[PDB]
Amino acid sequence: ELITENMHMKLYMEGTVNNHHFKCTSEGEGKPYEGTQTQRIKVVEGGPLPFAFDILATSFSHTFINHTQGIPDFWKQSFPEGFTWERVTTYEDGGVLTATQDTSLQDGCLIYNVKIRGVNFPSNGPVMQKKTLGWEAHTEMLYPADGGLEGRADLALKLVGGGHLICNFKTTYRSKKPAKNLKMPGVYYVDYRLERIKEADKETYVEQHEVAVARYCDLPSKL
Amino acid sequence: ELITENMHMKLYMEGTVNNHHFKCTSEGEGKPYEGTQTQRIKVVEGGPLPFAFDILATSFSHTFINHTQGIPDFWKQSFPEGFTWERVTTYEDGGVLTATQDTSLQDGCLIYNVKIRGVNFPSNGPVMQKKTLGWEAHTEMLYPADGGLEGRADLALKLVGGGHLICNFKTTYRSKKPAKNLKMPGVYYVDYRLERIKEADKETYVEQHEVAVARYCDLPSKL
């Protein structure tokens, strides 16, 4: 009821990657129950970025996940109080990006605030050389833990030339609404497909779209 | 032709975890194209093990994955010569288990040889204290790299008390057949459900079952 069939969002982001400071803002809309959303993003300070915009892509929205098979929706249930996440992303060539995010509801509009810190991206790597070409689809495994919700995923960033650079995600999701009012799920999975739809002016403007669907493992069980 | 609708398997394993040496053997059967299999495992030396048998479970069979949607089957394609894999498993509480495996084929029987080295499992952790209760379903992401196939997964080990201990898998699979005769796959995923069906004598006998399916991401694409 606080989350309708069509919702809007605004986001602010600040951070540093390899000592380069930056800020972005975005505005967007999506269909939270169909698991689809679009954001239009502007780099408002520090642009154009000296690194691939792709490494920020996954920091720009778990309210827009289509929960199928009757799975309890941890995020849509956190409102009106909303929720937070904290994440560490570790690239296999040494880059490390940590992000913290707060999600709120204000005037029927979702509001995101994100802080980012990236270090040790190799100066001759594809991130710093801007030889990346977006993310492959990926699956996140989610499991209840210490009141919150933990997520784990491995993602592959496409490269110029056809190879991939791998990174690992460890995330912690926390509700701001009293646990008493939270029906926790069990272990389940979310498939994502995050796609760059448009970029302009050396990635100082980026339009991104995402579809996400929560599901169980549908393999038969003998137990 | 070489891989039939119904196949048997035999396995030998030797290794050391936290300085404790052991050997196991198993006999099994499954349906390679349906992606199902069962193994009956014996610890024949160093048993009962002073650690959870669960950490060995994933080292006991990629020929038995149901490949859908025309996805080229790296493993089934590798025969008669077969394939090897080498894996590093890193637990979030410090345990590291590395494993090397050779798969061959003889008399229509798959033959597995595994060597294991486990170190730094915390003496008071759930592995060494045997407070584990089996593995949740998991997804492995696979992609071609430098003439072989890479796999990445995060897995959740269930614990007495209801929580989980997470570990990350990095695996390299290599065909023992000349590349000339192998069609490589693009990025794709395999979902696994590995279940303990029986144990006897403090896990010195263990019956395990697995079902595994290869897939792409079914999510619609905007691009």
- Residue whose C-alpha is closest to residue B149's, from B100, B193, B85: B85
Contacts of A137 in chain B (CB under 8 A): 216-217, 219
Three-class secondary structure of residue A56 per DSSP = helix
Q: Which amino acid is at A178?
A: P
In the block, tokens 């760059």 appear at A196
CB B161 within 8 A of CB B62: no
* Rounded CA separation A168/A153 (Å): 6
In the block, tokens 């990174």 appear at A167
The helix or strand, by DSSP H or E, that contains position B126, with its residue range, turns out to be none
Of A137, A152, A156, the CB nearest to B154: A152
Give the gyration radius of chain B's Cα atoms. 17
Q: How far apart are the first and last CA of chain B?
A: 38
Longest Cα pair distance anywhere in chain B, in angstroms? 56
Cis peptide before B80 (omega within 30 of 0): yes
Half-sphere exposure of A46 (CA within 13 A, CB side): 18
Total Cβ atoms within 10 A of residue A70: 6
Strands A205-215 and A36-45: antiparallel
Total Cβ atoms within 10 A of residue B44: 14
Q: C-alpha angle with apex A50: A49 to A52, nearest 5 degrees?
A: 80
Q: Which residues does residue B215 pair with via DSSP β-bridges, in sequence order? A: B189
* Cβ–Cβ below 8 Å for A217 and B166: no
In the block, tokens 């448009």 appear at A198
Joined together, the tokens standing for residue B214 give 């290869």
DSSP state of A55: H
Q: Residue B181, by phi and psi: left (phi above 0), alpha (psi -120 to 50) or beta?
A: alpha
Q: Give residues with Cβ within 8 angstroms of A162, minimum separation 6.
A: none
B143–chain A Cβ distance below 8 A for any pair: yes
* Rounded CA separation B71/B147 (Å): 17
Strands A188-200 and A205-215: antiparallel
Q: Helix H segments across A12-146? A: 54-57
* Rounded CA separation B33/A35 (Å): 33
Strands A66-67 and B205-215: unpaired
Q: C-alpha angle with apex B145: A18 to B3, nearest 5 degrees?
A: 150
Cα separations (Å) of B43 from B18, B33, B111, B120?
A: 17, 29, 17, 22
Cis peptide before A80 (omega within 30 of 0): yes
Q: How many helices (H) and strands (E) does chain A have?
A: 1, 13
Which A residues, 169 through 198, put their C-beta within 8 Å of a C-beta on chain B? 187, 189, 191-193, 195, 197
* Cβ–Cβ below 8 Å for B192 and A136: no
For B138-154, b/e burial (b = at least 16 CB within 10 A) is bbbbbbbeeebbbbbbb
φ, ψ for residue A57 (rounded to 5)?
-55, -50
Substitution target from B92, B135, B146, B152 for chain A, most A beta carbons within 10 A: B152
* Rounded CA separation A49/A56 (Å): 11
Three-class secondary structure of residue A10 per DSSP = strand
Strands B164-175 and B83-91: antiparallel
B220–chain A Cβ distance below 8 A for any pair: yes
Gaps in chain A after residue (C–N beyond 2.5 Å): 60
Closest CA in chain B for residue A66: B219
Q: Residue B203, by phi and psi: left (phi above 0), alpha (psi -120 to 50) or beta?
A: left
Three-class secondary structure of residue B132 per DSSP = strand
Whether the CA torsion B217, A82, A171, A133 is positive or negative: it is positive
Cα separations (Å) of A213 from A32, A172, B192?
A: 10, 19, 19
A48–chain B Cβ distance below 8 A for any pair: no
CB B190 within 8 A of CB B214: yes
In the block, tokens 């080990």 appear at B157
Contacts of A209 in chain B (CB under 8 A): 222
* Cβ–Cβ below 8 Å for B136 and A156: no
* Rounded CA separation B38/B31 (Å): 9
* Rounded CA separation B95/A122 (Å): 28
In DSSP notation, B24-80 reads EEEEEEEETTTTEEEEEEEEEESPSPSS-THHHHTT--GGG-EE-TT---HHHHTTT
In DSSP notation, B140-200 reads EEEEEETTEEEEEEEEEEEETTS-EEEEEEEEEEEESS-GGG-----SEEEEEEEEEEEEE
B141–chain A Cβ distance below 8 A for any pair: yes
* Rounded CA separation B66/B33 (Å): 5
A:B CB pairs within 8 Å? 87
Total Cβ atoms within 10 A of residue B38: 18
* Domains annotated on chain A, with CATH: 1-223 (2.40.155.10)
Q: Give residues with Cβ within 8 angstroms of B46, minimum separation 6.
A: B20, B21, B22, B23
* Cβ–Cβ below 8 Å for A187 and B143: no
* Rounded CA separation B125/B12 (Å): 28
* Rounded CA separation B125/B54 (Å): 13
* Cβ–Cβ below 8 Å for A192 and B219: yes
* Cβ–Cβ below 8 Å for B191 and A221: no
Substitution target from B91, B93, B139, B213 for chain A, most A beta carbons within 10 A: B139
* Cβ–Cβ below 8 Å for A195 and B153: no
Substitution target from A141, A171, A172 for chain B, most B beta carbons within 10 A: A141
A220–chain B Cβ distance below 8 A for any pair: yes
In DSSP notation, A123-156 reads TTSTTTTT-EEEEPPEEEEEEEETTEEEEEEEEE
A164–chain B Cβ distance below 8 A for any pair: yes
Structure determination method = X-ray
* Rounded CA separation B223/A118 (Å): 29
Give the gyration radius of chain A's Cα atoms. 17
